[PDB]
Amino acid sequence: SMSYTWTGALITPCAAEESKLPINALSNSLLRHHNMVYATTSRSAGLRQKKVTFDRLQVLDDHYRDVLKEMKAKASTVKAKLLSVEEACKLTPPHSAKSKFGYGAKDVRNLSSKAVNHIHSVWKDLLEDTVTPIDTTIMAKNEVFCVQPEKGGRKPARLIVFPDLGVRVCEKMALYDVVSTLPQVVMGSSYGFQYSPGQRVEFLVNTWKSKKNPMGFSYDTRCFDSTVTENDIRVEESIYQCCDLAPEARQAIKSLTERLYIGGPLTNSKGQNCGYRRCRASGVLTTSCGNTLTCYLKASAACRAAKLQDCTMLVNGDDLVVICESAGTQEDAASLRVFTEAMTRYSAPPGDPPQPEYDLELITSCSSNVSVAHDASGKRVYYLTRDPTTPLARAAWETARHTPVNSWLGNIIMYAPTLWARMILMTHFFSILLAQEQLEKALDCQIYGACYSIEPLDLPQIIERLHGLSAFSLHSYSPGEINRVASCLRKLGVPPLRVWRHRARSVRARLLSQGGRAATCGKYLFNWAVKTKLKLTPIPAASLSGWFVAGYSGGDIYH
């Protein structure tokens, strides 16, 4: 069936949209070519709708069914519990979209009389009605990027599709536990969200060394969400049902599936009807989990339809990477062809055709790759890096304009070992926070879809905990990585690494002169900037688990 049926009504903004870098005094200190940093808006939604709309075809295999059965067998190992309205209410982000029925996220968090009651009726309703499609709103996301390599190329807005607040709270009550528990049990170590960046690099590096003759590849499917068939959503519903669940939970989950997850009517911000969705919704609590289970089911099947080798996959929603035993150059290449044919047959066709790689550092999944550096003791150390462009792009925007979720902080957390995060992002923002006396101010950032409130002065403890003390000592970065950064610094008009050294010696000096927590930030985060480096002892006050358990992208999770 068609992933989308449109009425011709337009996907419309709810708030004025800014599309250009709101240039600043401070902003210009970070980036110069402010005319290569845009933000997506409603304007380009028509384009997105065209790319994301298409007919789907699926042809299941015995390979597919065998894997489904194993998954199910494994799923029937889990016992999930239903959340109390209190529990589900607390997990709601403070800024969450207000309900069309009078109350808001603030009321939900306070357990307001009217809030809980609407929630209680949406629940009762779900239990009584298992057929009326539930209404959802469709919006065009406002994310910023840097202009496509070639001067021109812009990204057309991504589309978010979500139900009413009251429903969202109901999703938490019935599936939150399933969604942060079942995925790992079913896919074991293949479940990507159970790892912190360091753990991911360790799993990829060892899996690569474990192979006698290693081959690896990342698979990029086109509009995964659109490729998700109604049947895919029901199959995934059956996997949740394999858990030991409460009678009401099975009922709430069965209904959410038939009324919301399988598909439903789309409504723009002006209450106008936009069309109908017969695929995954980017804005529900199961988007991430559904996508990971489904992507994993197809990829695994697709592996059997090829490899006579020892596959190890890492799956993060629609992101996939497999490392197996090479069977030779021309033979491996054949295998990926079959793999792609298999995946396409399951309604998961490729954007770019997958390419056999024989160098782990050349593989990129989750827009990241493994790279090598050295720690204080000279030892070789692997860490996860990224192409700094979007992070730098979004840092500039976040300097010039006030954002609800700020990526610079999350990038620092996810990429504390990189030379760009360490030298530019850290140096830039601690400088700003210093100037404006905002060091104690908790800020909101996101990890694996979930929103968190982090105090920038904890970065040290946080980083040692996730990356280890060595995140403060890496120094012999790859000629490759170094060029990548410098080259991007060129393109964006970001001052050279050499300037960041000086700036950071300054920032490190200010932090120190305030002792306590800022000095700790100065002592550990900028030890790289000083000439005569001083040794760093395991941070005492640094001894987070709920941080890398599961994925909640599009979900409505707060912590």
Binding mask 403-442 for ligand 617 (x = CB under 6 A): ----x--xx--x----------------------------
Report in angstroms how near the CB of residue 26 gets to ligand 617 at its nearest: 21
Q: What is the 3-state secondary structure (H, E, C) of 279-299?
A: CCCCCCCCHHHHHHHHHHHHH
CB neighbour class for 292 (10 Å; exposed up to 12, middle 13-18, buried from 19): buried
Minimum gap (Å) between residue 390 Cβ and ligand 617: 8
Residue 418 CB, shortest distance to ligand 617, in Å, is: 11
The answer to the question of residue 467 lying near ligand 617 (CB under 6 A) is no
State which residue, 407 or 427, has the beta carbon closest to ligand 617: 407
3-state secondary structure 328-368: CHHHHHHHHHHHHHHHHHCCCCECCCCCCECCHHHCCECCE
367 binding ligand 617? (CB under 6 A): yes
Nearer to ligand 617, 267 or 411 (CB): 411
For residue 293, the minimal CB distance to ligand 617 (Å) is 18
Residues 30-49 that bind ligand 617 (CB under 6 A): none
Sheet holding 214-219, edge to edge: 214-219, 319-325, 312-316
Give the nearer residue to ligand 617 in terms of CB position, either 257 or 446: 446
Contact between 168 and ligand 617 by CB under 6 A: the answer reads: no
Are the C-beta atoms of residues 395 and 37 closer than 8 Å to each other?
no
- Closest approach of ligand 617 to the CB of residue 459, in Å: 13
Angle at 418 between CA 325 and CA 369, to 5 degrees: 20
Question: Of the candidates 169, 321, 366, 451, which one interacts with ligand 617 according to CB under 6 A?
Answer: 366
- Which residue from 124, 102, 126 is spatially nearest to 113, judged by alpha carbons? 102
Give 67 or 201: the residue with its C-beta nearer to ligand 617: 201
Shortest Å distance, C-beta 487 to ligand 617: 19
Q: Are 79 and 244 in contact (CB under 8 A)?
A: yes
Return the CA Rg of the chain.
24
Q: What number of other Cβ atoms are within 10 A of residue 198's Cβ?
A: 20
Q: Does 453 bind ligand 617 (CB under 6 A)?
A: no
The smaller minimum CB distance to ligand 617, of residues 522 and 551, is found at 551
3-class SS string, 91-111: CCCCCCCCCCCCCCHHHHHHC
Residue 368 makes contact with ligand 617 by CB under 6 A = yes
Instruction: Give the strand pairing for 264-267 and 136-140.
Output: parallel
Cα–Cα distance, 294 to 45 (Å, whole number): 27
Q: Does 448 bind ligand 617 (CB under 6 A)?
A: yes
Binds ligand 617 (CB under 6 A): choice among 34, 56, 200, 484: 200
What is the enclosing helix (H) or strand (E) of 435? helix 427-435
Binding status of residue 283 toward ligand 617 by CB under 6 A: no
Residues in contact with ligand 617 by the rule CB under 6 A: 195, 197, 200, 366-368, 384, 386, 407, 410-411, 414, 446-448
